[PDB]
Design an enzyme around this catalytic site. Structure first.
Site, PDB file in Angstrom:
ATOM      1  N   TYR D  26      -0.886 -10.223  -4.915  1.00  0.00           N
ATOM      2  CA  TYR D  26       0.447  -9.980  -5.742  1.00  0.00           C
ATOM      3  C   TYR D  26       1.251 -10.673  -6.580  1.00  0.00           C
ATOM      4  CZ  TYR D  26       3.846  -7.579  -3.022  1.00  0.00           C
ATOM      5  OH  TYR D  26       4.507  -7.495  -2.237  1.00  0.00           O
ATOM      6  N   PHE D  36      10.066 -10.230  -9.674  1.00  0.00           N
ATOM      7  CA  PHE D  36      10.803  -9.558  -8.522  1.00  0.00           C
ATOM      8  C   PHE D  36      10.349  -9.966  -7.441  1.00  0.00           C
ATOM      9  CE2 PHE D  36       9.129  -5.547  -6.592  1.00  0.00           C
ATOM     10  CZ  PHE D  36       8.262  -5.469  -7.283  1.00  0.00           C
ATOM     11  N   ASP D  37       9.179 -10.182  -7.256  1.00  0.00           N
ATOM     12  CA  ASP D  37       8.137 -10.299  -6.027  1.00  0.00           C
ATOM     13  C   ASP D  37       7.381 -11.102  -6.714  1.00  0.00           C
ATOM     14  OD1 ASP D  37       8.040 -10.342  -3.529  1.00  0.00           O
ATOM     15  OD2 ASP D  37       6.182  -8.517  -3.568  1.00  0.00           O
ATOM     16  N   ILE D  56       3.449   1.937  -1.413  1.00  0.00           N
ATOM     17  CA  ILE D  56       3.556   2.537  -2.285  1.00  0.00           C
ATOM     18  C   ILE D  56       2.609   2.853  -3.332  1.00  0.00           C
ATOM     19  CG2 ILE D  56       6.029   2.119  -3.111  1.00  0.00           C
ATOM     20  CD1 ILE D  56       4.977   0.048  -5.355  1.00  0.00           C
ATOM     21  N   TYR D  82       9.264   3.359  -6.741  1.00  0.00           N
ATOM     22  CA  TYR D  82      10.963   4.128  -5.563  1.00  0.00           C
ATOM     23  C   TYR D  82      11.472   4.995  -6.384  1.00  0.00           C
ATOM     24  CZ  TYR D  82      10.202  -0.213  -2.793  1.00  0.00           C
ATOM     25  OH  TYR D  82       9.463  -1.288  -1.780  1.00  0.00           O
ATOM     26  N   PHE D  99       2.327  -4.596 -11.640  1.00  0.00           N
ATOM     27  CA  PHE D  99       2.173  -5.298 -11.076  1.00  0.00           C
ATOM     28  C   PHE D  99       0.707  -6.496 -11.337  1.00  0.00           C
ATOM     29  CE2 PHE D  99       4.203  -2.257  -8.688  1.00  0.00           C
ATOM     30  CZ  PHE D  99       4.900  -3.393  -7.951  1.00  0.00           C
TER      31      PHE D  99
END
Lengths: 513, 201, 412, 107
Positions: D26, D36-37, D56, D82, D99
């Site tokens: 992912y 960011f990831d 999440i 979040y 994502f």
């Protein structure tokens, strides 16, 4: 070069292709650019596409003035008053308005950041709706630069959508189409007479910065008066592609990937490749100091701020920043120190606390030392501390996560640094004037620093330490000509080597006793 | 050669070559050997010791109290007090408390040191030597470690001198309003009796 | 002059005071580097003695009161004699930086008034003095690090958005989170909470693939129509996904530079470029992707044929995959200069032009691009106007440019 | 309840059952396009178990509709993300997350 000319330079390293360097040159006391360089020296051609820029005093007469409504005056009484495209510094993304007051034909509007069409006219997105059956075909979009025409108090009210006024009278052309775009406030102009512009229901600048009650508008020094200017040099993108082509069916083909390292300024939105900081000093120094702060914040073991910064600097970037032999002098040491202070300076201090305690179990493998085979230490059964690394994902079990360190693979890096050290010493031994960071300090200092901190951390075993001692001993990096702050690092490289024999000898005494 | 860290790091490295036996001198009062059945727990001591030491440089106190709780309840903390005398971990906690005394940290600090004296004789002798500073910190416990440093052993009962005791009765003269006298005298009873017979001097 | 109107008070020296500040600055001057180590210690010791003797009489407070008084206006009084008020004030703060620079004993006595200094930090006319004084305080006493709270750090943060790129702010914040030796971990969570996640004050960085596009030398200013065949995909050979975009572009404008100009380069990124094709093939125009669909939602896979279309004497561009209509919507853009196919890629991707030697096409509408190459030109391929050419010795440089079935007849 | 854009087709029929560990690569970015990831960054396929309340909720929900081979552009609304607190440092408060997930193997 001119209009349809083809040039061909050669910056040395083409002594075979140096045709007339024999008959004039060598014996005449001269040199090519081949005397040191193992890189290719980068080339800086001038650009074709223009890009907007700040306003220095480099005109005959152009003068913007920060005054206190809260306007920005001008002046252009000179020999050349052709075209002066103007825009404000920061844009607005997706309620407030914006003033101008012209004395003498002269436009205002909104520039979306993709705009480099320097043109003395009016010209230029227009896509229709698609609902999978045709059948709509109306619109989604208009915008791309907006056009309007004593005191002319034209005001561009936005949001939401886009409107216009003209001294109270709203004109036509309400381009009510921007989904989440960014909008530069901007002015296209010619200047006839001086003192041509002034700038600025509630009021404006609250909708711009981060404090957003801010109903009295207030100028800040970050506001500029950027002008679209023509030419600034560009780097040459030193290794491009290995594309290949065909003719029967035209198989155009590429298989060897190359990756950038870019950074995009957020408030003057554009992406620069990081190498072009080599000549741009302020954007170099501020990013260097930011790389310092990324280390100083995550210092002495903050095992949650490290998990924050692993999402922000993002490890395969660092493996590029170690490897790329072109990055500037400060920015190499910044990324090496950031690597050490994220992944390795948590455990390394935890091992230099336990370097003088020397306790050892007395079981059978501990007695099995031969004590003296008649530094690359054989068995070494002491009771050094224990390292655990955690994966920095993003799930909600983070309270158990943020307790040790982030992890990034040591097995790749510990071959990468040996490759880098061999490439370092065997090339730079012949006294190039090149070396990677400009001077040989940035070549060696944050390479031996990583080598030292990787040596301490319990890797580089026998099979690799045998390879390692060849770079120093041969029996050579210890024997070369070195400046002061690299041999300072080499002293701490030697001290752990001398200190390894003490850990050997204590285990020797216990294995005897 | 300028940058005088270079000169110092050169000559320390030079001197360690010509004094090998001196290096082996200054490493032998740190070594220790342990039987194999106690390998697995002392690592859990050592790994719980460094969390103390790495907390030396900083609400920051809840880690330390749990760390000292995990150290005090350990299996090998009674069993070989020469180890804990040699790892310096009396001086570690002493330094932490000194860093505090420029509230609930000092109280769960000094209880560890009062646990530290009553496990061995030589360990109590090692704890003794900070008494001269240690008396100057009556908060209300930080005086209990001055007591249990001289609680039982007669040699240490004889070794301490009169200026150590004079500032105690100086503090007692300070009680000229009280309530703090019930503890100060509780120090001095250990100073003159210590086994069953009153030490003359 | 703090009354309504004095307007005649002669007891106001300026040239006797503005001179005296430079004499005190030069009196409290730190010794340089280029000095012998037997007198550098003497001058350092004498400087510390002067700082302590000025501390004990409270001259710090005696200049703090002038800072209190003078921060009223922004340009005052009789406004010709007090013309140098900025140059006095900026020279005033400088004196405050010299009295506190060495002595930690000085820095402890300057503990309490830091909150008022960060209150004046929003004056933004003498902020250079305030930032220097604060940075020359925070490194010298650890006690002065305990006062400073979250409301101060957020003001220091807000200065960095109001004032662009000031590296002395980061020289402050690099010292706010590490003291002499110790680490104040209430400030480190705070800095990471405020300055980091906005991605706005700081220069965000990334790595992208090298983009490159190819042109088959054909120029076109009726229903023009050319095909592709994609045969090798590699969805991931990086730590990121690859790109493969087909389309058309114009010639008058936007030299196609790789990455250094607009965001990431490629195709579909300028207004002069119209491109399409993805896994889930949705288009690109002006480097913002819109979300057109198709009844398979497929990749540019190893088994597909893309049908691009472009119309002569009509501003209409619509695409097709395997013959299926995808509702191409590129309408009513500018007609300046010519058009030419561009198809872009960055992976291990090999793809086939279908122009002749066609493989599968309907012609629908009317024009194949095998007839735009009618008079003299041949079907050779280049690298989108080629400011480079990757070789060993010399990529040969170039000059810019020198720039159809409708000419005019000559009249008499 | 979450925006599931199919990118590549998998097999469609085999959606994973609860009580199986799921392997996924992912890559997540923000609404602005800032990444960011990743999971390709560290060459480690992620692993997680359905319903055990570690991930999440929008991620688990969007992975529950997917299949073998199927990759998707999950667009999570900030109430399922979040939320009002955000994450301390990596996620600004109240932003949508985008994502590109891709499932590989199951249990």
């Amino acid at each position: 070069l001119g209009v349809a000319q083809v040039g061909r330079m050669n910056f040395g390293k083409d002594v075979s292709t140096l045709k007339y360097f024999t008959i004039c040159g060598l014996q005449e006391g001269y040199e090519p650019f081949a005397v040191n360089t193992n890189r290719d020296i980068t080339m800086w051609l001038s650009k074709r596409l223009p890009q907007f820029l700040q306003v220095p005093s480099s005109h005959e007469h152009i003068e913007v003035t920060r005054i206190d409504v809260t306007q920005k005056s001008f002046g252009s009484q000179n020999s050349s008053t052709d075209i002066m495209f103007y825009r404000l510094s920061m844009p607005i993304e997706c309620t407030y308005y914006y003033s101008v007051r012209i004395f003498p034909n002269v436009w205002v509007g909104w520039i979306t950041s993709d705009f480099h069409q320097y043109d003395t006219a009016f010209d230029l997105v227009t896509v229709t709706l698609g609902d999978e059956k045709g059948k709509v075909h109306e619109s989604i979009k208009r915008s791309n630069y907006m056009v309007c025409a004593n005191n002319g108090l034209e005001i561009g009210c936005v949001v939401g959508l886009l409107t216009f006024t003209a001294n109270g009278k709203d004109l036509s052309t309400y381009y009510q189409v921007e989904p989440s775009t960014k909008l530069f406030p901007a002015v296209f102009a010619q200047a006839t007479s001086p003192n041509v512009f002034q700038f600025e229901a509630g009021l404006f600048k609250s909708e711009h910065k981060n404090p957003v009650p801010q109903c009295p508008p207030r100028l800040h020094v970050q506001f500029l008066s950027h002008v679209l200017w023509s030419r600034m040099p560009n780097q040459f993108l030193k290794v491009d592609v290995s594309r290949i082509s065909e003719r029967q069916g035209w198989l155009v083909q590429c298989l060897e990937p190359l990756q950038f390292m870019s950074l995009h300024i957020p408030e003057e939105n554009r992406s620069v490749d990081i190498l072009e900081l080599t000549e741009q000093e302020e954007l170099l120094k501020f990013h260097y100091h930011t790389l310092r702060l990324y280390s100083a914040v995550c210092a002495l073991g903050n095992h949650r701020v490290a998990h924050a910064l692993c999402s922000h600097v993002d490890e395969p970037q660092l493996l590029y920043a170690i490897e790329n032999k072109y990055m500037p002098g400060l920015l190499r040491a910044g990324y090496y120190d950031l690597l050490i202070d994220i992944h390795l300076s948590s455990y390394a201090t935890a091992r230099l606390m336990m370097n003088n305690e020397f306790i050892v179990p007395m079981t059978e493998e501990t007695k099995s030392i031969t004590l003296f085979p008649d530094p690359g230490i054989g068995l070494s059964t002491s009771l050094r501390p224990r390292m655990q690394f955690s994966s920095p994902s993003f799930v909600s079990i983070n309270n158990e996560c943020y307790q040790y360190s982030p992890e990034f693979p040591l097995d790749i890096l510990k071959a990468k640094t040996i490759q880098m050290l061999t490439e370092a010493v065997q090339e730079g031994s012949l006294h190039a004037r090149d070396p990677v960071g400009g001077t040989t300090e940035f070549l060696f200092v944050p390479l031996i620093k990583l080598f030292y901190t990787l040596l301490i951390m319990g890797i580089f075993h026998n099979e690799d330490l045998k390879h390692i001692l060849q770079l120093i001993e041969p029996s050579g990096l210890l024997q070369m000509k070195l400046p002061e702050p690299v041999k300072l690092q080499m002293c701490l490289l030697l001290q752990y080597l001398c200190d390894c024999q003490v850990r050997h000898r204590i285990e020797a005494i216990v294995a005897f006793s | 050669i300028e940058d005088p860290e270079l000169v110092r790091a050169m000559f320390v490295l030079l001197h360690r070559q010509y004094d090998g036996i001196g290096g082996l001198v200054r490493a032998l009062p740190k070594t220790y050997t342990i039987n194999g059945v106690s390998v697995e727990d002392t690592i859990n001591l050592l790994a719980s010791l460094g969390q103390i030491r790495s907390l030396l440089s900083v609400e920051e106190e809840k880690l330390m109290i749990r760390g000292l709780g995990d150290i005090m309840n350990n299996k090998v903390f009674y069993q070989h007090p020469n180890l804990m005398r040699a790892l310096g971990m009396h001086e570690t906690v002493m330094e932490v408390m000194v860093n505090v005394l420029g509230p609930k940290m000092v109280a769960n600090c000094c209880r560890f040191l009062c646990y530290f004296c009553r496990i061995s004789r030589q360990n109590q002798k090692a704890m003794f030597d900070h008494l001269s500073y240690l008396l100057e910190n009556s908060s209300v416990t930080p005086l209990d470690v001055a007591a249990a440093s001289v609680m039982d052993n007669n040699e240490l009962a004889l070794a301490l001198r009169e200026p150590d005791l004079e500032k105690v009765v100086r503090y007692l003269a300070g009680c000229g309003l009280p309530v703090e006298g019930e503890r100060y005298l509780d120090f001095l009873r250990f100073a003159v009796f210590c086994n069953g017979e009153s030490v003359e001097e | 002059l703090s009354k309504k109107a004095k307007a005649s008070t002669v007891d106001l020296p300026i040239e006797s005071v503005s001179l005296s500040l430079q004499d005190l600055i030069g009196y409290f001057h730190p010794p340089d580097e280029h000095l012998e180590h037997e007198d550098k210690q003497n001058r350092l010791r004498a400087l510390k003695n002067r700082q302590n003797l000025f501390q004990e009489e409270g001259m710090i407070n005696l200049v703090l009161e002038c800072i209190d008084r003078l921060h009223v206006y922004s340009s005052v009084a009789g406004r010709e004699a007090g013309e140098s008020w900025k140059s006095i004030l900026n020279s005033l703060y400088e004196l405050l930086a010299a009295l506190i620079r060495g002595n930690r004993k000085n820095c402890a006595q300057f503990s309490g008034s830091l909150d008022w200094l960060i209150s004046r930090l929003e004056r933004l006319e003498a902020s250079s003095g305030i930032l220097e004084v604060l940075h020359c305080v925070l490194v010298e006493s650890p006690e002065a690090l305990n006062i400073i709270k979250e409301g101060h750090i957020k003001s220091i943060i807000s200065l960095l958005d109001k004032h662009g790129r000031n590296h002395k702010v980061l020289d402050v914040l690099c010292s706010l989170c590490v003291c002499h030796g110790v680490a104040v971990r209430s400030n480190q969570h705070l800095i990471c909470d405020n300055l980091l996640p906005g991605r706005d004050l700081l220069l965000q960085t990334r790595l992208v693939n090298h983009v490159s596009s190819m042109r088959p030398n054909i120029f076109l200013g009726k229903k023009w129509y050319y095909e592709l065949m994609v045969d090798h995909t590699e969805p991931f050979v990086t730590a990121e996904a690859t790109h493969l975009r087909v389309g058309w572009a114009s010639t008058e404008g936007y030299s196609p530079y790789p990455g250094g100009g607009e965001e990431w380069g490629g195709n579909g990124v300028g207004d002069d470029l119209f491109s399409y094709g993805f896994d889930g093939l949705h288009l690109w125009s002006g480097c913002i992707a819109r979300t057109v669909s198709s009844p398979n939602q497929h990749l540019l896979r190893t088994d597909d044929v893309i049908s691009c279309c472009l119309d002569l004497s009509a501003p209409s561009i619509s695409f097709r995959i395997n013959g299926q209509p995808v509702q191409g919507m590129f309408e009513n853009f500018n007609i300046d200069g010519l058009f030419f196919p561009v198809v872009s890629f960055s992976a291990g991707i090999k793809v086939r032009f279908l122009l002749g030697e066609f493989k599968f096409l309907p012609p629908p509408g009317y024009a194949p691009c095998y007839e735009a190459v009618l008079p003299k030109e041949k079907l050779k391929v280049e690298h989108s106007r080629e400011y480079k050419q990757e070789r060993t010795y010399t990529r040969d440089l170039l000059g810019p440019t020198v720039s159809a079935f409708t000419p005019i007849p000559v009249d008499t | 309840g979450v925006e599931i854009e199919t990118i590549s087709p998998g097999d469609g029929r085999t959606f994973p059952k609860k009580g199986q560990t799921c392997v996924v690569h992912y890559t997540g970015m923000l609404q602005n396009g800032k990444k960011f990831d990743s999971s390709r960054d560290r060459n480690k396929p992620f692993k997680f178990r359905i319903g055990k309340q570690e991930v999440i909720k929008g991620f688990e929900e969007g992975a529950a509709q997917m299949s073998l081979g199927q990759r998707a552009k999950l667009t999570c609304t900030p109430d399922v993300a979040y939320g009002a607190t955000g994450h301390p440092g990596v996620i600004p408060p109240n932003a949508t997350l985008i994502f590109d997930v891709e499932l590989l193997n199951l249990e």
